[PDB]
């Protein structure tokens, strides 16, 4: 119910993977809760994962135009310290809810009968799902879901997504303009995730955390033949384009060091 809010010691660490265009902005709040049995740490995970959305001509077949785009963003936190437990995390998966309106009617002018039903729900571009978790860590996948277009909503799993009649010879000309692309595709993703962790006292001072950011890219191919447009879709074209950073935590000195980063 109440746990757990009292005195804090904060530390920050920021780092970027030039190779992958991914930035981790990590805040470490050491919690000295005088009502609590163990040591506590709140890890606030923010940063920037560029969409790395690209438009190109195939090397072997330059007449075919390819759009590569992030279908999923990957976020995870793990540790190996046996003295460390994951005791809270946000977001969590939740049960979807919807509004229903159902109607019956009759008319006599003659006999006539009518029925209608309306389901009403809220949609996101990208859905954040807990893909795995246990006492030592948690992994979220932020998945492309549904997008607004003229003539209605379209699913991320539709193959003709983003394809258009070419407005030119370039690869980009084969795909919808920036103003029809959502922020997470046109620009990128701004992660906000939290984890609360405990630490057993008198059994060691140091622990190591592996934080991972990344993308799963899908690829949409388009080309023109015989005045009909050929569009094809490769799902999980480039999976797990991720950067992993190792942070070392000292629960006694309240010190946090960056141990490693892959790739640089």
């Amino acid at each position: 119910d109440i746990g757990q809010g009292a005195e804090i010691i904060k530390r920050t660490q920021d780092i970027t993977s030039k190779r992958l265009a991914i930035t981790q902005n990590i805040q470490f709040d050491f919690v000295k809760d005088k009502k609590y049995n163990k040591d506590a740490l709140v890890v606030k995970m923010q940063g920037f994962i560029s969409s790395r959305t690209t438009y190109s001509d195939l090397k072997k077949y330059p007449y075919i135009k390819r759009m590569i785009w992030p279908f999923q963003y990957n976020i995870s936190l793990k540790t190996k310290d046996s003295n460390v437990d994951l005791i809270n995390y946000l977001p969590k998966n939740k049960i979807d809810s919807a509004d229903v309106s159902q109607k019956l009617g009759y008319n006599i002018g003659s006999g006539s009968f009518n029925y209608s039903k309306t389901i009403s729900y809220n949609q996101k571009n990208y859905v954040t799902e807990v893909e795995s978790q246990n006492s030592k860590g948690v992994k979220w996948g932020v998945k492309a879901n549904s997008f607004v277009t003229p003539n209605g909503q379209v699913s991320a799993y539709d193959q003709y997504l983003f394809a258009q009649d070419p407005t030119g010879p370039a690869a980009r000309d084969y795909f919808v303009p920036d103003n029809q692309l959502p922020p997470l595709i046109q620009s990128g993703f701004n992660p906000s995730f939290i984890t609360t962790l405990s630490h057993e006292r008198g059994k060691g001072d140091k622990s190591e955390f592996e934080i991972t950011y990344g993308r799963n890219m899908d690829a949409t191919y388009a080309y023109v033949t015989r005045h009909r447009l050929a569009v094809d879709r490769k799902h999980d074209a480039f999976k797990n384009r991720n950067v992993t950073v190792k942070y070392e935590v000292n629960w006694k000195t309240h010190e946090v060091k960056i141990k490693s980063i892959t790739p640089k």
Partner: peptide, 19 residues
């Protein structure tokens, strides 16, 4: 001449229910 009547109900619908 005509005579219409109807009834409408509004409720929540969830994929999974907790009891």
């Amino acid at each position: 001449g005509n005579t219409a009547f109807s009834e409408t109900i509004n409720y929540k619908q969830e994929s999974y229910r907790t009891t």
